[PDB]
Amino acid sequence: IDWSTLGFSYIRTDLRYLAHWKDGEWDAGTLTEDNQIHLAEGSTALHYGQQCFEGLKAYRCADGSINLFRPDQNAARMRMSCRRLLMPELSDEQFIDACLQVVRANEHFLPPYGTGGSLYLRPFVIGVGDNIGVRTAPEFIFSVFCVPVGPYFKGGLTPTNFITSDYDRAAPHGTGAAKVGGNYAASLLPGYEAKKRDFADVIYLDPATHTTIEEAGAANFFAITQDGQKFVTPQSPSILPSITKYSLLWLAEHRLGLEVEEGDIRIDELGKFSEAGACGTAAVITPIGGIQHGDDFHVFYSESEPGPVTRRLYDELVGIQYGDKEAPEGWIVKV
Amino acid sequence: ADIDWSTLGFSYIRTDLRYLAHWKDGEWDAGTLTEDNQIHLAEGSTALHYGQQCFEGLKAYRCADGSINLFRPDQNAARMRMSCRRLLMPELSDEQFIDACLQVVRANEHFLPPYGTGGSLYLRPFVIGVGDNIGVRTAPEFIFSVFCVPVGPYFKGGLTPTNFITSDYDRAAPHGTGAAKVGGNYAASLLPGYEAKKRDFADVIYLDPATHTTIEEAGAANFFAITQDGQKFVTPQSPSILPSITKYSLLWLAEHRLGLEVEEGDIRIDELGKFSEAGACGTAAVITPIGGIQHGDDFHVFYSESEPGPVTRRLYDELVGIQYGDKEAPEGWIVKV
């Protein structure tokens, strides 16, 4: 129970939410201790990747309350992921409700305020039931389990480097915009090579022709311009719509009077920005010390220090998440 | 077990026993046969969240003389090994792979369709990453299983052609997992295949990702075509298509015992007129003649919408004859069970 060292590893919490879909409708759903999934050997989820998931965090505020960050946004996104894979959808009603039931039942795992930790929720859907042909499963399972994670930066916003790859994580018109297992399995090998060559991860350029930046592994990418006034993130049908990215996209315009733009970010002109970063629920902005592309490295601001704008974005979001800052209208749901 | 051999299609049927092996601490389990058709893994398994999974498909056939054939099992074990490497999963030697397949066939012989039913016993070997996990990383443990299902045709019973249509969607990236038999590629093909099926087409025909101008695959089979003079067998060569065992076998048969010239190159959809006949090939398909391909508003018919081309029949009759023991098997292709 030592929130101190605690990292981002699996830990068996008390209860999970579990719902079955059959004959066209979802069931009431229930809480279980099982933490073990059982499915037909021919399950579509094991052979054809008919699986998708979400990830969000719950936090314990100073005033003793509990914050659930934009659960609705994840519900909307998972609906799209299920859409792409022919799986039944879940309404904000059912999605948020399951997340709430799980946070409450496992409240004793919510890291106490002070230690930058939180409760990670892993909602997911998978196809099940007897099967061999390439088609959608006759049945599906929806589950939500949580695991207490600790502060990602057990020291502070420490920047790390990334490297370019010739491998793709998504096709131009594949499942890139959906949070489906297939995309992660494809990044698995290139990710192993990057870590090996002592790098944080890899930055995928773009299926068609590797000229523009897509995503920085399992997290979106953004860059502040030299003048430090304009916020830039890549726009593309093949990248995952990061909820953190969109929130950082908001905090920049309505909390930092900065210019904002969703467009192309060629790997030719990186010197066009003063600082760059990778954002995500787990990542929560990883300052990018430098990007290795070919035989030349390229640092933006520093390789041991986060740029100012980046730090401001980091602190504003973390503020909202924990409640030490007014939360925008809509975001944050009390548990 | 009471099974209507005449009704048999391509659908899941619980056979008696499956093989199951566990990988722990860098080593593979001995391998064990079981009655349990249900798999049990950690709620956070890589196979359930990060698509860390790959599989194979091959058949066993009953011959006229009574013996049993397992078609090029060595090739599947080789391809699975390649798939496992792409997903950082432990490999399986040719020996382990075949041995598991033989045990399942022998333990389920009574499910092997009798010779002359055109049916067979389908084997589905696969490997999944399991064990408690949470971060995007290769699993700590894995499972290797082989179960079988008796079947008949996948698309249609007989050499009757069926039509295909192109799609703006991609089942794989130019430099993705197209070369490996992994779940993700099929997951992506779900929506397009569904739309093509909804419009009466057998399946989608995928073009090359980025600059959709060259034929890739059918989603469940490889694509091949014959020159207008019926002298050349042509099939797309791409780093993103699955290396079909049935395709390489056809490639071999066409060259020897069929006397055609062979070519592994590019086939743009705008030049379908260069071909007198076309087809889709695979273990499940065992050559499905392509009646006609739909591209936007153009519906191109190579030969017939109801009859298969003559070379296609020749290729078909040869490959199937070998599989069931009616024609001479080339060196090392058949393994007797």
Q: Do residues A231 and A224 lie in contact, with contact meaning Cβ atoms separated by under 8 Å? A: yes
Residues B132 and B172 grouped into a single domain = no
What does the alpha-carbon distance between residue A295 and residue B20 come to, in Å, rounded to a whole number? 47
Residues B305 and B218 grouped into a single domain = yes
Residue B173 CA neighbour count, 13 Å, CB half: 26
- The minimal CB distance from A85 to the residues B88, B124, B187 is found for B187
Residues B95 and B179 grouped into a single domain = no
Cβ neighbours of B45 in A, within 8 Å: 37
Chain B contact for A174 (CB, 8 A cutoff):
yes
Which of A39, A52, A124, A173 should one mutate to test binding to chain B, selecting the residue with the greatest count of B CBs within 10 A?
A173
Residues B144 and B169 grouped into a single domain = no
Please state, as a whole number, how many other Cβ atoms lie within 10 Å of the Cβ of residue A9: 13
Q: Do B86 and A189 touch (CB under 8 A)?
A: yes
Cβ neighbours of A147 in B, within 8 Å: 134
The method recorded for this entry reads X-ray
Cβ neighbours of A50 in B, within 8 Å: 183, 187, 190
Rounded to 5 degrees, φ, ψ at A50 are -80, 75
Please state, as a whole number, how many other Cβ atoms lie within 10 Å of the Cβ of residue B221: 26
Please state, as a whole number, how many other Cβ atoms lie within 10 Å of the Cβ of residue B6: 9
Chain B contact for A244 (CB, 8 A cutoff):
no
SS3 track for chain A:
CCCCCCCCCCCCCCCEEEEEEECCEECCCEEECCCEEEEECCCHHHHCCCEEECCEEEEECCCCCEEECCHHHHHHHHHHHHHHCCCCCCCHHHHHHHHHHHHHHCHHHCCCCCCCCEEEEEEEEEEECCCCCCCCCCEEEEEEEEEEECCCCCCCCCCEEEEECCCCCCCCCCCCCCCEHHHHHHHHHHHHHHHHCCCCEEEECCCCCCCECCECCCCEEEEEECCCCEEEECCCCCCCCCHHHHHHHHHHHCCCCCEEEECCCECCCHHHEEEEEEECCCCCCEEEEEEEECCECCECCCCCCCCHHHHHHHHHHHHHHHCCCCCCCCCCEEC
**Nearest-neighbour CA in chain A from B183: distance (Å):** 4
Tell me the count of A-B CB pairs closer than 8 A. 222
Residues A147 and A168 grouped into a single domain = no
Residues B103 and B180 grouped into a single domain = no
Question: Collapsing DSSP states into helix, strand and coil, what is residue B330?
Answer: coil
Contacts of B331 (CB under 8 A, 6+ apart): none
Q: Do residues B28 and B109 lie in contact, with contact meaning Cβ atoms separated by under 8 Å? A: no
Residues B136 and B249 grouped into a single domain = no
CATH number at B145 reads: 3.30.470.10
Contacts of B69 (CB under 8 A, 6+ apart): B60, B61, B62, B63, B323, B324, B325, B329, B334, B335, B336, B337
Q: Do residues A52 and A181 lie in contact, with contact meaning Cβ atoms separated by under 8 Å? A: yes
What does the alpha-carbon distance between residue B193 and residue A139 come to, in Å, rounded to a whole number? 19
What does the alpha-carbon distance between residue A178 and residue A125 come to, in Å, rounded to a whole number? 13
Final residue in a domain of this structure, among A155, A176, A205: A155
Structural domain span for residue B234: 158-337
Chain B contact for A42 (CB, 8 A cutoff):
yes
Q: Do B40 and A42 touch (CB under 8 A)?
A: no
Q: Do A181 and B210 touch (CB under 8 A)?
A: no
Residue set of the binding site of A for L-glutamate: 48, 122, 134, 152, 281-283
Residues A59 and A191 grouped into a single domain = no
Chain A contact for B43 (CB, 8 A cutoff):
yes
Which of B104, B170, B211, B213 should one mutate to test binding to chain A, selecting the residue with the greatest count of A CBs within 10 A?
B170
What does the block give as tokens for A61?
Answer: 């505020």
Residues across chain A: 335
Residues B201 and B325 grouped into a single domain = yes
- Count of domains forming chain A: 2
Query: Which residue is closest to A120 within chain B, CA to CA?
Result: B134
Q: Do A188 and B220 touch (CB under 8 A)?
A: no
Residues B272 and B186 grouped into a single domain = yes
Chain B contact for A167 (CB, 8 A cutoff):
yes
Chain B contact for A80 (CB, 8 A cutoff):
no
Chain A contact for B169 (CB, 8 A cutoff):
yes
**Nearest-neighbour CA in chain B from A63: distance (Å):** 30
Chain A contact for B111 (CB, 8 A cutoff):
no
Residues A199 and A275 grouped into a single domain = yes
Final residue in a domain of this structure, among A122, A155, A188: A155
H/E stretch holding B20 reads: strand B18-24
Q: Which residues of A118-152 are buried (b: 16+ CB within 10 A; e: fewer)?
A: bbbbbbbbbbbbbbbebbbbbbbbbbbbbbbbbbb
CATH number at A260 reads: 3.20.10.10
Cβ neighbours of B123 in A, within 8 Å: none
Final residue in a domain of this structure, among B116, B132, B157: B157
Q: Do residues B194 and A90 lie in contact, with contact meaning Cβ atoms separated by under 8 Å? A: no
What is the rounded radius of gyration, in angstroms, for the C-alpha atoms of chain B? 20
What does the alpha-carbon distance between residue B82 and residue B243 come to, in Å, rounded to a whole number? 11
Chain B contact for A193 (CB, 8 A cutoff):
no
CA A44 vs CA A290, A312, B177, B190: distances in Å: 41, 44, 18, 11
Closest by CA position to A253, among listed A281, A278, A277, A229 = A229
Residues A309 and A164 grouped into a single domain = yes
Chain A contact for B30 (CB, 8 A cutoff):
no
